[PDB]
Amino acid sequence: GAMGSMERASLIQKAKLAEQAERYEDMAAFMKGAVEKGEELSCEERCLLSVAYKNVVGGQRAAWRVLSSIEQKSNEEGSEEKGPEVREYREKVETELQGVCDTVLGLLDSHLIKEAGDAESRVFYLKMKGDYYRYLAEVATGDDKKRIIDSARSAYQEAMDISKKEMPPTNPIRLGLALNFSVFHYEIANSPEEAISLAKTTFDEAMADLHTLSEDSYKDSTLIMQLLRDNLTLWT
């Protein structure tokens, strides 16, 4: 790895600088190097990893949707043949996206998840595993599509099972996991009723727990609760 010669602490420092400069590809490469040092990550370092790759893959997803839209229009009735270029370039972006997803899933498998014993780390990594299989599912069309979807579901489910046993209902990681698994149900699994039920039950159980929280914890939890209610508003 090109970051093998750089100190772990220097990689973390430069990831933070890259975030300040909105250089998310750099930030992801620095965090990849930090993970590959083989030590467990702290809470803050897990955030740096997830922010970096979320921004990289988010950009790729946005681009892929633009191109897929153009490609679909090109294949409608009455559209003038434009050649293979739209498909080729959509495929190029798609392959790069899959590569990023495979890289993140690789870090989780080698060896972040197997060393993550605390709920706060293990749930976070399993949620990420669900997220990056979900991104693969968004572009999947082949023999393995159902297996990709089930890989996302399995990771999310394991994360949910732990989060319900080991975290309070207002824990922001528990809330964010439920937010994203709900979107998985709605957008990937064709299960809108399950998406809505999960978002609503998650919201209501968090509401009932807010009274236990400090002002700062309250702010953190209500932020994610508002995203649950935003999705519910979109869907109902």
Binding site: D131, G176, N180, V183, E187, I224, L227, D230, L234
Partner: peptide
């Protein structure tokens, strides 16, 4: 698109 974090 729906919100995810």
């Amino acid at each position: 698109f729906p919100a995810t974090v």
